[PDB]
Design a protein around this ligand. Structure first.
Ligand SMILES: COc1cc(-c2ccc3c(n2)CN(c2cnn(CC#N)c2)C3=O)cnc1OC
Length: 826
């Protein structure tokens, strides 16, 4: 069972989709996966330590960077321990374990003050990510000595040689000028079309019957597992598509009569174009009716030709000659882990004997299994180009080597790669499931990532809902309760936002009656509907309480987002500084998340070289359909507001440096803010250029009261500019027009340092950019090819440097021209 069904309805409301539903299925694949995921779930649930699971220590194995070492040049770290009224400092060694620190206190568990963050485990104090954050931001480590959480709170509820042929019967649309239509049928494996047959064109009426056998060149014997029957309707524009796996989840050849509801084309290779899901909109979609009733040493010239192809970028095209060379010299190629994506692409997957030879090659995998982990290389074997389950599994096996900290870095992109999986049950989906069940911070973000996709994609909601349910059946009752609180808040907040948008007109000014109407709605919610407290979706250590209703406003944007301010539910909190969240409707925040995540990856790439470029990747989490939560960075303003304070537009190079010294109460702070500005500006010019999101308006660029520059709103994105480096930015650097400056020559120094460092991880970035465009930007070959030129691929560090320095010179030669042209719109 009775309560066994009351739990499934809880699960459904938490997921945002009912997995028990068989209304849009043509086989048991979803149900088989739903059952197949119980084993890996139970295995991980039974293997995790309960107390370390409860305290989820956020830690790293990585060295403490050189810049944070200067911050503690004394070899002594101060930790202040609180208990009721008492608070006492303790001199600690960076290498000390929290247990050894605790020993020193009791001679005279640890929880971060105001956060659900624990400094527990056999890790040194220099390796805790909260300690590193204090070091970087020049903060004092305030901790409280309390009782550990009880693990009983994390408990789980007890659970032939013939040619292939397809008969196409016809097509039917409920509602349709007098045009012409035909059906194109493709045998696809990865992005490769193994065979293509078409029907004769028939007039485009609402019922189009053919009754034709489409006999392909491929033998049934030769059909590879994970091959798709891609059925397309053309009129020459592609209007409809649908896919069918030819070999099912139990290795059987697909047979019988099918009535498939198809996807419409709107306005190129999207992840949506690969889905095995059928369109659930039965009343308005197009349907298709089908029937299935079926060694000497290498010459130097060649080794060099082979090395030159192996060394090449992931977006460099492999010619037939390259593919034959790679395939012929496959045992030499196997010696290079970097050759693996190229070598697996040179395989004729439509030939059973070649696939067997490929599997034989995969068995001689000592040099791959030995090799150090390259995530960029691993991600390449997980994109749209690899559809083989054994090729993909060797990538997933490399991921198992990642520490939890690295999982969170790639998690979003890893969840998106599940879209490229032929089957619902994959090594990738099981890996994500196991990692989320092991660490609460991974499971927290995995929930929201999986949820954002269920609510915004019809193409993949069915697969992601089976993965979420498998996670939510193992995360444990406390985790379940947290998600419940969080989902309740978002739902009532979404309600409020839609009502606010409706009252307002299209007029620039947000009505003062509307901002009062909001104040009344938020008061009528807090009284008996809204939960007393919830975990912040984009910062799960941080718990929000009751709204500060007098601080809540509607932002003067045409999407009318909600500026919300909450009290911190934690009594031990160091400050009375409110928690600020932007609740926005209309924008699909997945793109923003994807860009904000690449920003974090670029920060790690930089850390690898002891380089800190002070980026500010603010919290941003897609919570549902066209909705989400955005972190409000406290003590921050837009460059456009600084440009409207002393100037007051309907600009001036002076105002920024003027605003910085006005905001800094001391000279050693103002100059620190100027270096912070020059590093953050360098960082954002570099990051923004390689991503091609450089040409921005002053409005979408912010700065903190500490000179920390940061771009915002990457949603959407004649005279062009590579990045934003307007004369006001140059004024803080102490220059005008074409003039040298100690800070400016240093800014060029940081840019080149940062740019050449990003170029050291070219492959990782290209693959992430491509994956982002494929799974989050609904793209073409040209749009993807941008980053190749941006990262000056195949070029030496000198030519590459001459490129970025000229980019700086473009912004200087253009001044405020492109900036004013942005304002000329308004
Ligand atoms: C509403 O549209 C967006 C805004 C931001 C964004 C992010 C951070 C901040 C803001 N907007 C505004 N803001 C801010 C303004 N004043 N203060 C200081 C305070 N309190 C903070 C931020 O920190 C990010 N993405 C968006 O669209 C996808």
């Amino acid at each position: 069972s009775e309560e066994s069904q009351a739990f499934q309805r809880q699960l459904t409301a938490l997921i945002g989709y009912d997995v028990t539903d068989v209304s849009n299925v043509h086989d048991d694949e979803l149900e088989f996966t739903r059952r197949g995921l119980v084993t890996p779930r139970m295995a991980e649930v039974a293997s995790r330590d309960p107390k370390l699971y409860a305290m989820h220590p956020w830690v790293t194995s990585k060295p403490l960077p050189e810049y944070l070492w200067k911050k503690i040049a004394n070899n002594c770290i101060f930790i202040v321990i609180h208990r009721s009224t008492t608070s006492q400092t303790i001199k600690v060694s960076p290498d000390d374990t929290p247990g050894a620190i605790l020993q020193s206190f009791f001679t005279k568990v640890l929880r971060v003050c105001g956060r659900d963050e624990y400094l527990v485990g056999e890790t040194p104090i220099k390796n805790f990510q909260w300690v590193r954050h204090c070091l970087k931001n020049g903060e004092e480590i305030h901790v409280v000595l309390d009782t550990p959480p009880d693990p009983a709170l994390d408990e789980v509820r007890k659970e032939c040689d013939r040619k292939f042929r397809v008969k196409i019967r016809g097509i039917d649309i409920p509602v349709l000028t007098d045009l012409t239509v035909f059906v194109e049928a493709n045998i696809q494996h990865g992005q490769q079309v193994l065979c293509q047959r078409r029907t004769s064109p028939k007039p485009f009426t609402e019922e189009v019957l053919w009754n034709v056998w489409l006999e392909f060149s491929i033998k049934i014997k030769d059909l590879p597992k994970g091959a798709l029957l891609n059925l397309q309707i053309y009129c020459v524009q592609l209007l409809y598509y649908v896919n069918l796996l030819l070999i099912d989840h139990r290795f059987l050849l697909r047979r019988g009569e099918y009535v498939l509801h198809m996807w419409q084309i709107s306005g190129s290779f999207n992840a949506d174009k690969l889905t095995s899901a059928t369109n659930p909109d039965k009343e308005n979609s197009m349907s298709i009716s089908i029937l299935l009733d079926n060694r000497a040493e290498m010459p130097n010239q060649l080794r060099k030709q082979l090395e030159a192809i192996i060394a090449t970028d992931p977006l460099n095209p492999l010619t037939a000659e390259d593919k034959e060379l790679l395939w012929h010299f496959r045992y030499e190629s196997l010696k290079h882990p970097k050759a693996y994506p190229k070598l697996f692409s040179s395989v004729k997957w439509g030939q059973q004997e070649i696939v067997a030879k490929t599997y034989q090659l995969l068995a001689r995998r000592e040099v791959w299994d030995q090799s150090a982990l390259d995530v960029g290389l691993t991600m390449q074997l997980l994109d749209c180009n690899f559809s083989d389950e054994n090729v993909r599994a060797i990538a997933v096996q490399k991921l198992e080597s990642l520490e939890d900290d690295d999982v969170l870095h790639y998690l979003l992109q890893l969840v998106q790669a599940v879209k490229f999986e032929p089957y619902h049950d994959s090594a990738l989906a099981r890996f994500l499931l196991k990692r989320g069940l092991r660490n609460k911070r991974i499971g927290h973000f995995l929930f929201w990532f999986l949820r954002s996709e269920i609510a915004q994609s019809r193409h993949y909601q069915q697969r992601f809902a089976v993965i979420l349910e498998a996670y939510l059946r193992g995360c444990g009752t406390a985790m379940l309760h947290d998600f419940t609180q969080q989902v309740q808040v978002i739902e009532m907040l979404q309600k409020v936002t839609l009502d606010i948008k409706s009252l307002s007109a299209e007029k620039y000014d947000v009505s003062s009656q509307v901002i009062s109407q909001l104040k009344q709605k938020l008061e009528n919610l807090q009284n008996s509907q809204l939960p007393e407290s919830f975990r912040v979706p984009y910062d799960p250590g941080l718990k929000a309480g009751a709204l500060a209703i007098e601080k809540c406003k509607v932002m003067a944007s045409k999407k009318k987002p909600l500026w919300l301010e909450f009290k911190c539910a934690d009594p031990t909190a160091l400050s009375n500084e409110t928690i600020g969240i932007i609740f926005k409707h209309g924008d699909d925040l997945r793109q923003d998340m994807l860009i904000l995540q690449i920003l974090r990856i670029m920060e790690s790439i930089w850390e690898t070289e002891s380089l800190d470029l002070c980026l500010l990747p603010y919290g941003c989490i897609s919570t549902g359909d066209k909705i989400g939560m955005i972190e409000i960075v406290k003590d921050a303003t837009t460059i456009a507001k600084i440009q409207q304070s002393t100037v007051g537009n309907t600009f001036k190079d002076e105002v920024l440096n003027h605003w910085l010294k006005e905001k800094s109460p001391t000279e050693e702070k103002f100059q620190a803010a100027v270096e912070r500005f020059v590093y953050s500006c360098a960082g954002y010019c570099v990051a923004t250029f390689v991503l091609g999101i450089g040409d921005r308006h002053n409005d979408n660029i912010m700065i903190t009261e500490t000179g920390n520059l940061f771009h915002i709103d990457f949603g959407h994105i004649k005279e062009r500019v590579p990045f934003v480096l307007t004369p006001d930015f140059l004024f803080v650097m102490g220059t005008s027009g074409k003039k040298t400056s100690p800070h400016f020559q240093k800014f060029q120094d940081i840019c080149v340092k940062a740019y050449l460092a990003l170029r050291h991880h070219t492959n990782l970035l290209i693959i992430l950019f491509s994956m982002m465009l494929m799974t989050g930007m609904p793209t073409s070959k040209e749009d993807i090819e941008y980053i190749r030129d941006a990262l000056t691929v195949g070029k030496n560090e000198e030519d590459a440097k001459k490129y970025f320095l000229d980019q700086i010179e473009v912004c200087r030669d253009k001044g405020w021209t492109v900036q004013f042209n942005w304002f000329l719109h308004l």
